Design a protein around this ligand. Structure first.
Ligand SMILES: CN1CCC2(CC1)c1ccccc1N(Cc1ccc(C(=O)NO)s1)[C@H]2c1ccc(Cl)cc1
Ligand SMILES: [K+]
Ligand SMILES: [K+]
Ligand SMILES: [Zn+2]
Length: 385
């Protein structure tokens, strides 16, 4: 059984941000055009009985002041003083993470979806749950970052590890380092975080690499030491090299940690067609690195959460996440989901030009040391625990 988060309210909220616009609509509608919805259980966003119940849930990670400020920001944008500016600036609610009429409703909705997905996994209603509206891994306890205002991921994991020793393995496939999720669990050995990403001088967010005798690689602290794994890669990596880099690490993490739940952030800014143009991954299937990683994770047969994330080429993002959904249906339910190479006709068909194919329009054409480092860390982590 495979679940997917969507709904009327969820849709408009997820499409109300200025940075991602209608991206969520394209994803859900392409999946729908391919007749996959009949194979998926809808997971309705989580709702609360009172504003106080909502606050306690969101303040499980964020501070009351920050949540307060995010709430006020929406109010002000729905119609600013000098003191307000200093207040907003103190939470980074400016510049990269500005406000808009629905800034709070938009951020909370992601939390609503990811929390519902975790409960769907906890009560065993679904073996895997997808949420293309979540995955905002940059949100910090009291700080917005990289257009991430509330960390739906952290709250979801908290719910998972809180349920009836539970250990959760977090895999971050986004092009950017998943700093927010990593810092939240810096001190906890019960949540092992693994992020593969690009890193270089001046590149956002700057973390997930060496620190500065010689450089050192931080990996948690306290009881959580050796619990934060990072693999930074240089620009230009292809599907093969990427899968080869993360492959053995993924296997070894599942073997050593034996997770009770796996949370996968599947941000789509690694595609060769993303505006960043850093990695050269595709969405191909005869092979895409994304699908190779999801297939390997699903093979573990562990209750898994699949989240969205970055991705500013909206059509190609939907192109990738549609195949992830189909592949998930194949692995979990055992029913092959042969997809049509041709994009099917639907409301957003125009946006998929000029070729209107499911494959992204791209023609493709060191890590060894990191493996030894990461293996040593895994041995240090296994022993420590
Ligand atoms: C503002 N607030 C101050 C406290 C700090 C960041 C946020 C924090 C809050 C909660 C848990 C941990 C941590 N930090 C320790 C680290 C976490 C990941 C690291 C890495 O290097 N990953 O690759 S270091 C601090 C930090 C994080 C990043 C930087 Cl650049 C500087 C300081
Ligand atoms: K990442
Ligand atoms: K950890
Ligand atoms: Zn990203």
């Amino acid at each position: 059984s495979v679940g997917i988060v969507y709904g009327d309210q969820y849709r408009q909220l997820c499409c109300s941000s200025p940075k991602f616009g209608d991206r969520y609509a394209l994803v859900m509608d392409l999946i729908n055009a391919y007749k996959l919805i009949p194979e998926l259980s809808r997971v309705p966003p989580l709702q609360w009985d009172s504003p106080s119940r909502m606050y306690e849930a969101v303040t499980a990670f964020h501070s009351t002041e920050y949540v307060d400020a995010l709430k006020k920001l929406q109010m002000l944008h729905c119609e600013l003083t000098a003191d307000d500016e200093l207040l907003m600036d103190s939470f980074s609610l400016n510049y990269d993470c500005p406000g808009f009429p629905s800034v709070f409703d938009y951020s909370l909705a992601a939390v609503q979806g990811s929390l519902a997905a975790a409960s769907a996994l906890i009560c065993r209603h679904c073996e895997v749950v997808i949420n293309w509206g979540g995955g905002w891994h940059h949100a910090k306890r009291s700080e917005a970052s990289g257009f991430c205002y509330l960390n739906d991921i952290v709250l979801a994991i908290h719910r998972l590890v809180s349920s009836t020793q539970t250990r959760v393995l977090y895999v971050d496939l986004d092009l950017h380092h998943g700093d927010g999720v990593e810092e939240a669990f810096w001190y906890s050995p019960r949540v092992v975080t693994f992020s593969v990403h690009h890193a270089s001088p001046g590149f956002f967010p700057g973390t997930g690499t060496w620190n500065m005798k010689l450089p050192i690689f931080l990996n948690g602290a306290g009881r959580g030491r050796f619990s934060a794994f990072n693999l930074p890669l240089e620009e230009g990596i292809n599907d093969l090299d990427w899968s080869n880099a993360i492959g053995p690490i993924l296997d070894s993490l599942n073997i050593v940690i034996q997770p009770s739940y796996v949370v996968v952030q599947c941000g789509a800014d690694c595609l060769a067609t993303d505006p960043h143009r850093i990695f050269r991954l595709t969405n191909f299937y005869p092979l895409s690195g994304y699908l190779y990683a999801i297939k390997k994770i699903l093979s573990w047969k562990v209750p898994t959460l699949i989240l969205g994330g970055g991705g500013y080429n909206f059509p190609d993002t939907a192109r990738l996440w549609t195949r992830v959904t189909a592949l998930t249906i194949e692995e979990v339910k055992g029913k092959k989901m042969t997809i049509s190479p041709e994009i099917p006709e639907h409301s957003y068909f125009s946006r998929y030009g000029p070729d209107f194919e499911l494959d992204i329009d791209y023609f493709p054409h060191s890590i060894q040391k990191h493996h030894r480092r990461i293996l040593e860390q895994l041995r240090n982590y296994a022993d420590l625990n």
